[PDB]
Enzyme design. Structure first.
Site, PDB file in Angstrom:
ATOM      1  N   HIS A 116     -11.180   7.076  -2.022  1.00  0.00           N
ATOM      2  CA  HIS A 116     -10.490   7.774  -0.949  1.00  0.00           C
ATOM      3  C   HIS A 116      -9.264   8.509  -1.465  1.00  0.00           C
ATOM      4  CE1 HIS A 116      -8.610   3.879  -1.362  1.00  0.00           C
ATOM      5  NE2 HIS A 116      -7.597   4.259  -0.604  1.00  0.00           N
ATOM      6  N   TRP A 117      -8.762   8.106  -2.625  1.00  0.00           N
ATOM      7  CA  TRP A 117      -7.661   8.804  -3.257  1.00  0.00           C
ATOM      8  C   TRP A 117      -8.041  10.216  -3.548  1.00  0.00           C
ATOM      9  CZ3 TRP A 117      -3.190   7.026  -6.239  1.00  0.00           C
ATOM     10  CH2 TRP A 117      -2.624   5.926  -5.612  1.00  0.00           C
ATOM     11  N   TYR A 155      -2.102  11.252   1.236  1.00  0.00           N
ATOM     12  CA  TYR A 155      -2.955  11.168   0.065  1.00  0.00           C
ATOM     13  C   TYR A 155      -2.911  12.449  -0.750  1.00  0.00           C
ATOM     14  CZ  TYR A 155      -4.581   6.633   0.872  1.00  0.00           C
ATOM     15  OH  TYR A 155      -4.626   5.274   0.986  1.00  0.00           O
ATOM     16  N   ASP A 213       0.862  -1.190   0.000  1.00  0.00           N
ATOM     17  CA  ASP A 213       0.000   0.000   0.000  1.00  0.00           C
ATOM     18  C   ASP A 213       0.893   1.233   0.000  1.00  0.00           C
ATOM     19  OD1 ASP A 213      -3.062   0.715   0.450  1.00  0.00           O
ATOM     20  OD2 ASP A 213      -1.873   2.042   1.711  1.00  0.00           O
ATOM     21  N   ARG A 214       0.679   2.208   0.894  1.00  0.00           N
ATOM     22  CA  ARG A 214       1.476   3.422   0.863  1.00  0.00           C
ATOM     23  C   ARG A 214       2.949   3.097   0.973  1.00  0.00           C
ATOM     24  NH1 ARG A 214      -1.927   6.158  -1.456  1.00  0.00           N
ATOM     25  NH2 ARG A 214      -0.796   8.159  -1.113  1.00  0.00           N
ATOM     26  N   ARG A 262       4.366   2.377  -2.202  1.00  0.00           N
ATOM     27  CA  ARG A 262       4.607   3.564  -3.012  1.00  0.00           C
ATOM     28  C   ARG A 262       5.902   4.232  -2.618  1.00  0.00           C
ATOM     29  NH1 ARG A 262       0.368   3.747  -5.789  1.00  0.00           N
ATOM     30  NH2 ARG A 262      -1.254   2.391  -4.898  1.00  0.00           N
ATOM     31  N   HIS A 301      -6.819  -6.938  -0.208  1.00  0.00           N
ATOM     32  CA  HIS A 301      -5.726  -6.004  -0.262  1.00  0.00           C
ATOM     33  C   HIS A 301      -4.661  -6.325   0.755  1.00  0.00           C
ATOM     34  CE1 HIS A 301      -3.717  -2.260  -0.875  1.00  0.00           C
ATOM     35  NE2 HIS A 301      -3.988  -1.814   0.334  1.00  0.00           N
TER      36      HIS A 301
END
Lengths: 297, 297
Positions: free
Chosen positions: B153-154, B217, B108-109, B112, B278
């Site tokens: 939510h992005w 975000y 997830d984050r 990234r 996820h």
């Protein structure tokens, strides 16, 4: 709550899907005005008196909004689809003896309006839609820039109770934030504070909030599907139509509004108005003059 | 209250120029940094880290601003929560441990951060694993109605403060549990360890932590996207051997088939779906842990 329509009557119109509240004023050809989100019929309060000089003006709360009744929704959000809302308002107008009428809608009300014109074009003499493009077009143009601009289209459409739960912590904040964020000025100054109180009071009711989410859920799903059918079938609104949009409004962010509406409507004129999204409140005189001009011939 | 889900792991407060990184550290062997994402903390690795710790020095870190890591003051560009800045901070953290060349798996984050790290400073990584993401550019590029609804939510969390902060404040416990549950294959919290959910819930109960998540975000919508765009436009590829794992029901597979996507981003990528939503290391810890050990060892 203030009476913002001095001299307008108040009608509670029974329909099969619940009562429609409306203020009713003026005389002459019937003109139904439909508000959107997060507002109620009182958003017309600056333009309705001018309209009421020439028309029998019916200023209705959308099904589930304002003081109209809230049909229970279902898994397909059916009563809050614009198709259903349009049918319910048709029924409402028929109760008043108006089987052929003019229609101006703003925001969600404008979506009811063009869906009405697609589904039941014989009901409409002329149609005006304020600061929208069809729901299909917003979704079809949903790229990064636009997803950020109208995030609420995808946030409010999240399955219940997610938006409802987040909105319920401080509903006042969100209704004022949306009112403010979509004006030209970015604050509440364009609005009559008495009108703001109407919006805020409506928004304070969890059931009303839920309905608004249902509206947006319909907007993400059935409404989009219904629009999709029409665009892919090349069905065009045959009712003479005015598209007004705010120079700083939502619709013009997605695309050139008249270009888009010409794909959906055979007879459309359009004009920008220097305004954010809330054309009748930010730019009442310009909006009122545009509507009077259009509906008067 | 907060359980220790890494028995035998040390707990390390790593100083960096931007604040402390909290990490659990266990194992011995080559260093492997594990980065969680949203809305979790490092404890999401609690089921896979011990298996990894049989062969690696496993550093299970809270992202900057997340969990118990310090929260750098953000700025108008959300700079410290851009993945570029978080990668720089985690590089600095790893240097405090003497790890200048390490293995990295992110979810997830954290994933990234991880691929941005790989793009910016690929000399720092032996091997990279990303769990259930596509590059941020790809999510925004693929932005359409379906993805807008799915990863609403992005765009919601990227709205200007304090809108998402205020809304998340409406029901934070509901929100974090809703995100956790809705992104699992089960649709409920049964894949998670209740003690882990408590960690996530406590972190999410802190408004400052929630603001950081929104900053993340916001970065995700703006700078992170721009940084990714530069790499796509320059044709820059990750040169580090990488493994892309994704949930057969996860976030990555809806937008586009992840391995084909990552191959546009990475010169040497292998990939596998994992039968999970996820939260691969929690829903499918054995499969995830097996894949990672196989890839990293």
């Amino acid at each position: 709550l203030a009476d913002l329509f001095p001299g307008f009557g108040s009608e509670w119109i029974n329909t099969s899907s619940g009562r429609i509240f409306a203020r009713v004023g003026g005389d002459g050809p019937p003109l139904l005005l439909l508000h959107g989100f997060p507002q109620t019929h009182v958003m017309w309060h600056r333009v309705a008196p001018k309209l009421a000089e020439r028309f029998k003006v019916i200023v209705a709360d959308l099904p589930g909004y304002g003081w109209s009744d809230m049909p229970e929704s279902d898994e397909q959000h059916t009563p809050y689809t614009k198709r259903a809302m349009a049918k319910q308002l048709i029924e409402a107008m028929e109760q008043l003896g108006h089987v052929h009428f003019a229609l101006a809608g703003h925001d969600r009300g404008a979506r009811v309006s063009y869906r009405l014109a697609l589904d039941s074009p014989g009901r409409l003499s002329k149609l005006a839609v304020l600061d929208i493009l069809p729901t299909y077009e917003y979704w079809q143009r949903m790229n990064r820039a636009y997803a950020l601009k109208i995030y609420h289209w995808s946030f409010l459409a999240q399955p219940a109770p997610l938006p409802e739960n987040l909105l319920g912590g401080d509903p006042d904040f969100y209704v004022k934030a949306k009112l403010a964020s979509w004006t030209r000025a970015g604050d509440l100054s364009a609005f009559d504070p008495r009108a703001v109180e109407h919006y805020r009071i409506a928004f304070a009711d969890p059931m009303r909030r839920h309905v608004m989410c249902e509206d947006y859920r319909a907007g993400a799903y059935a409404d989009f599907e219904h629009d999709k059918i029409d665009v892919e079938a090349g069905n065009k609104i045959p009712v003479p139509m005015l598209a007004l949009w705010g120079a700083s409004g939502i619709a013009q962010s997605a695309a050139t509004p008249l270009d888009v509406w010409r794909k959906w409507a055979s007879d459309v004129q359009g004009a920008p108005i220097e305004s954010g999204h809330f054309l009748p409140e930010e730019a009442p005189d310009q909006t009122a003059e545009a509507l009077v001009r259009f509906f008067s011939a």
